[PDB]
């Protein structure tokens, strides 16, 4: 079988400016943060992003690399809750916002996974969501009557097709079989299935037989058809939660948010954490932690 192990930069060099990319996980939970940091090091820009947003999106906005965002929400999941870089991008008018209901985003990925042009959904009707979409979001009428008479008109959620997707899981093999070891898979499978290029990071790469013995079969969320390249990235979700491996780095996340509030503070953060490799970031982070 194919050995799909690659490095962070090698994966990101498959991106092109203008692409639509999906970032998996949820909020400040199991985000592919090492992939995001590698995007920050590249020249790739003008990205359309599909995400249940958190500090992943914040980092991309801080770099001015985002043209448009399709999102169900943006949250840090802990105080100060709102991502300050996403907030800056929104209040400055830097990004086009394709805001939607959380369920709609999932539905959009499901339609892309099934290669369907749309799925019907109630979520969205009556809300400001259609107005975010500026007439791009259309409706569909049921050909069957409701129990009660009348024909329902529903949101036609379009497929959220992706040029590339990035996800992070706890354990994988060299061929891209992978498992989540936490309580929630989120929607990483749909992000991968909706994309033309599939990129996965894991905390640790093991033999197939070790992978399958360490989890129940229901945790084997990713098979070889769902991955083009796998990257071993210990700490690759930092500073979001990666379940039994490590929690959210709460103090560091607050440090991130505080630093975003001023020009000098951000420049110092970039210098300290984001100006070298992933290994430099991990060492700087451990040193911040050792201080506390």
């Amino acid at each position: 079988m194919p050995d799909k192990r690659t490095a962070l930069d090698d994966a990101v060099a498959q991106l092109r400016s203008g692409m639509t990319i999906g970032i998996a996980g949820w909020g400040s939970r199991r985000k592919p943060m090492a992939f995001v940091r590698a995007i920050l090091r590249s020249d790739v820009t003008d990205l359309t992003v599909v995400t249940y947003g958190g500090p992943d999106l914040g980092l991309l906005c801080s770099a001015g690399k985002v043209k448009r965002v399709y999102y169900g929400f943006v949250s840090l999941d802990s105080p100060p809750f709102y991502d300050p870089w996403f907030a800056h991008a929104r209040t400055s008018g830097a990004i086009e916002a394709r805001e939607m209901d959380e369920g709609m985003l999932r539905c959009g990925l499901q339609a892309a996974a099934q290669r369907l042009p749309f799925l019907p959904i109630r979520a969205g009707l009556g809300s400001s969501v259609p107005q975010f979409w500026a007439g791009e979001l259309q409706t569909v009428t049921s050909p069957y009557p409701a129990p009660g008479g009348g024909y329902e008109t529903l949101i036609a959620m379009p497929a959220l097709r992706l040029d590339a997707a990035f996800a992070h899981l706890n354990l994988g093999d060299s061929h891209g079989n992978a498992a989540y070891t936490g309580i929630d898979p989120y929607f990483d499978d749909l992000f991968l299935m909706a994309a033309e290029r599939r990129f996965l990071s894991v905390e640790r790469i093991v033999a197939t037989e070790e992978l399958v013995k360490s989890v129940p079969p229901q945790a084997l969320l990713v098979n070889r058809m769902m991955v083009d390249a796998i990257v071993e990235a210990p700490g690759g979700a930092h500073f979001t939660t990666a379940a039994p491996d490590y929690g959210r780095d709460e103090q560091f996340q607050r440090h991130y948010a505080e630093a975003a509030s001023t020009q000098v503070g951000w420049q110092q953060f970039v210098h300290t954490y984001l100006s070298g490799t992933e290994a430099d970031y991990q060492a700087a982070v451990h040193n911040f932690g050792a201080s506390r």
């Binding site: 943006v74 805001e99 209901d101 369920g103 979520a123 969205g124 009707l125 329902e152 929607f187």
Partner: protein, 249 residues
């Protein structure tokens, strides 16, 4: 009893006759109320641990130490499935609520260039089109209770198209604030006073709301917590008094 305790019981009463459905309290005050309901008059409700498991018992809010017993699995995918199926009652916060019950947790100002950014709409649109939704507001003021919200995250009664049966599950139930209990039984489903908390006059509500609340002068007093309710709140559910941080002044 304190104002916070009267509010906690008012939140509990949201779930009377809920039956065997998932209650999703998204604020601490609602979560005290939901746990009170489960331990008393709504014993069949389902509650998560705040993440992805269903709780078997009803432990203290915010608690650490002993692990919780579980009765099921409720990852976010299954929450979406549950909400579309309709077997749920969510209590959300609200940066704005308007007189037809539209809620905003998204942003202030224009959609493509807001003056202040919050979470985005989250699941509010799906929640309000699918099943019982109520709101907890800890600082009842004019900047929260507005004429019309900046961004419609949770839909209100004025958005219902009576010719489209897709709106047939709308059930925006009540708003509980630090001042009173409110519903949408006024004319055109405009906001109506159910009750005013002890110590609150109609004038207090009038000065704190940007529109006129129906039946405000006729509103009875919100009922006091009973001795058993106070015991459960103080000793069992909220021993650290997280409820007190939910309300101001």
């Amino acid at each position: 009893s304190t104002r916070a305790e009267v509010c906690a019981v008012a939140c509990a009463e949201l779930f009377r006759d809920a039956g065997e459905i998932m209650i999703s309290p998204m604020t601490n005050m609602a979560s005290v109320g939901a746990r009170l309901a489960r331990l008393t008059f709504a014993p069949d409700i389902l509650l998560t641990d705040g993440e992805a498991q269903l709780l078997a018992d009803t432990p203290a809010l915010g608690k650490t130490g002993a692990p919780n017993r579980i009765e099921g699995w409720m990852p976010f995918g299954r929450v979406f499935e549950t909400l579309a199926w309709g077997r749920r009652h969510v209590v959300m916060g609200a940066n704005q609520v308007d007189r037809y019950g539209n809620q905003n947790i998204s942003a202030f100002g224009p959609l493509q260039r807001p003056t202040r950014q919050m979470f985005g709409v989250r699941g509010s649109p799906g929640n309000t089109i699918n099943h019982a939704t109520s709101y907890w507001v800890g600082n009842h003021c004019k900047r929260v209770f507005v004429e019309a919200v900046d961004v419609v995250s949770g839909i209100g009664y004025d958005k219902v198209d009576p010719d489209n049966p897709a709106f047939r599950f709308v059930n925006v139930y009540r708003v509980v604030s630090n001042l009173g209990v409110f519903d949408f039984g006024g004319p055109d489903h405009s906001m109506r006073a159910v009750s005013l908390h002890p110590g609150v006059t109609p004038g207090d509500v009038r000065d704190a709301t940007s529109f006129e609340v129906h039946d405000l002068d006729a509103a009875e007093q919100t009922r006091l917590p009973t001795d058993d309710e106070l015991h459960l709140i103080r000793a069992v559910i909220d021993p650290k008094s997280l409820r007190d941080r939910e309300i101001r002044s």
